[PDB]
């Protein structure tokens, strides 16, 4: 639908022997295409999708150079944040960064994102105007001042409006057969006798992309919200996703129940029942 | 492509 690119940084300190670890992963929509991990013997940026493999060595050198320098900077950021919060060296701490661009109707930046977190909590975020910051607490304000003085917002805006969009567009062209293709769920309903007089109806959605999906059970058109067992959307391991929804129903009354499935790759409303 | 390095210093938190 509306396409996006996101990078995810995790920088983690350990109290034990060893330098802080930096991990980066890149996504186009729900597809991972790249990874970097500083823990490998000689860390290197690695392809995670086939359509990225066509990029030449210069691209990989450039990526690695960027991630190595980030690795060194984050080690310093971790020490700095330890100081702002007056924490000892005894604990393990984590900085997380999430940034990237959404593509607009006109092929330009719709909005940019650049949010950071410390120990699982919001720390600092770039505002929608890409010129100012929102800090979560007083410690983050120290970072804000430093970043305002160093004019970091300008640098991020340069990327979010420039290379983020250009490269996203290039990836979308190079990987169009998968990145611009929605895969409809394969759907079916299973029946499992849960006691003498009741039975579980399970509605399955398999092999779909993107992850976004809605599965809802109905009895005679009425929503069974409070009685529906609905698992979180999980990856299949082959870049598709799975989900199921279940209801416990009185035996012989299975025809009353309908499953409803909504997904981008489905151009019509889909309704299923159990089929013997 | 991730955010590339600036000409100047990469600023820590």
């Amino acid at each position, epitope marked *: 639908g509306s396409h996006s690119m996101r990078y995810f940084y995790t920088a983690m300190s350990r109290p034990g022997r060893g330098e802080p670890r930096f991990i980066a992963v890149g996504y186009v929509d729900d597809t991972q295409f790249v990874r970097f991990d500083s823990d490998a013997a000689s860390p290197r940026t690695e392809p995670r999708a086939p359509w990225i493999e066509q990029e030449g060595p210069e691209y990989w050198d450039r990526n690695t150079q960027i991630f190595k320098t980030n690795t060194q900077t984050y080690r310093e950021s971790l020490r700095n944040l330890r100081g702002y919060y007056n924490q000892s060296e005894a604990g393990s701490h984590i900085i997380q960064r999430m940034y990237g661009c959404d593509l607009g109707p006109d092929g330009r930046l719709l909005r940019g994102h650049d949010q950071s977190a410390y120990d699982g909590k919001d720390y600092i975020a770039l505002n929608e105007d890409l010129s100012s910051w929102t800090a979560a607490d007083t410690a983050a304000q120290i970072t804000q001042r430093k970043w305002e003085a160093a004019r970091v917002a300008e640098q991020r805006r340069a990327y979010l409006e*420039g290379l983020c969009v250009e490269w996203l567009r290039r990836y979308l062209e190079n990987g169009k057969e998968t990145l611009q293709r929605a895969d409809p769920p394969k759907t079916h309903v299973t029946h499992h006798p849960v006691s003498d007089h009741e039975a579980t109806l399970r509605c399955w959605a398999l092999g779909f992309y993107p992850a976004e999906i809605t599965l809802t059970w109905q009895r005679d058109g009425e929503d069974q919200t409070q009685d529906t067992e609905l698992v979180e959307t999980r990856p299949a391991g082959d870049r598709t996703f799975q989900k199921w929804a279940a209801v416990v129903v009185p035996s012989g009354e299975e025809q009353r129940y309908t499953c409803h499935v909504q997904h981008e790759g489905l151009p019509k409303p889909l309704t299923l029942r159990w089929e013997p | 492509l991730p955010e590339p390095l*600036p*000409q*100047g*210093q*990469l600023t820590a938190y």
Partner: T-cell receptor, first 114, second 112 residues
Framework: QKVTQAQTEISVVEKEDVTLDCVYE???????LFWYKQPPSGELVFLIR??????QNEISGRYSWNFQKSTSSFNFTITASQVVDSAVYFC????????????FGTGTRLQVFP | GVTQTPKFQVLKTGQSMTLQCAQD?????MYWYRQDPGMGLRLIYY???????DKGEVPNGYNVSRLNKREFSLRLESAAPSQTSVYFC????????????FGPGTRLTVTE
């Protein structure tokens, strides 16, 4: 990528206004521009940095800059010229990143006669 | 900001010499330029990071070395009279108002 300063020498008398032209070409969507001063002493002194997404007009005392993206120009105006302004002025263009190259114009010599 | 040695130099044609540039602002990038009367500043070589060098507009007759984050060396292996120029090291950033991004320049004359 190119920075053109068409003017070689400019001569004005004290108190006259002067405009130094800078035309540029870029492939990048995103870039920034410098103006530098080089007094007879030889050193380079920073005057201004303008990013491609910044505003058209800025005034710092007797200095002012007109950045026009659509005309690809970054004209530098000195109001009420003074002998102190005698120098060679350089316009420069550069992408935002470590891999990008800072490119300089041919420079323009300003002479402010009393 | 950035420093340079020496400030002045005389060389004989064929002789070697290395110009030193140092920068203690933890910049990623460093640039060598030559100035010639009417040509402006022309890029010789630049360095994007430690252990990485790339050719500028006029690399011919020059080599560079980026041994660490701080230092960027320009060498003339076999000096020619056409290399008579003023050399400038540069390390641009975002605080041009507070920091010096150009060295004071070195004046080099290669004579026969």
């Amino acid at each position: 990528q190119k920075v053109t300063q068409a003017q070689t020498e400019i001569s004005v008398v004290e108190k006259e206004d002067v405009t130094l032209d800078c035309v540029y070409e870029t492939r990048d969507t995103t870039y920034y521009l410098f103006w530098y001063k080089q007094p007879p002493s030889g050193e380079l002194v920073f005057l201004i940095r303008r990013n491609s997404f910044d505003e058209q007009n800025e005034i710092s005392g007797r200095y002012s800059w007109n950045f026009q993206k659509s005309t690809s120009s970054f004209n530098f105006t000195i109001t009420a010229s003074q002998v102190v302004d005698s120098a060679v002025y350089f316009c420069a263009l550069s992408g935002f990143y470590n891999t990008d190259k800072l490119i300089f114009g041919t420079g323009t010599r300003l002479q402010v006669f009393p | 900001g950035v420093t340079q040695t020496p400030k002045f130099q005389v060389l004989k044609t064929g002789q070697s010499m290395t110009l030193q540039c140092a920068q203690d602002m933890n910049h990623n990038s460093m640039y060598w330029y030559r100035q010639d009367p009417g040509m402006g500043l022309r890029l010789i070589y630049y360095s994007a990071s430690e252990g990485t060098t790339d050719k500028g507009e006029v690399p011919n007759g020059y080599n560079v070395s980026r041994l660490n984050k701080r230092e960027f060396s320009l060498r003339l292996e076999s000096a020619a009279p056409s290399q008579t120029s003023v050399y400038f090291c540069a390390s641009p950033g975002l605080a041009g108002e507070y920091e010096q991004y150009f060295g004071p320049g070195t004046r080099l004359t290669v004579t026969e």
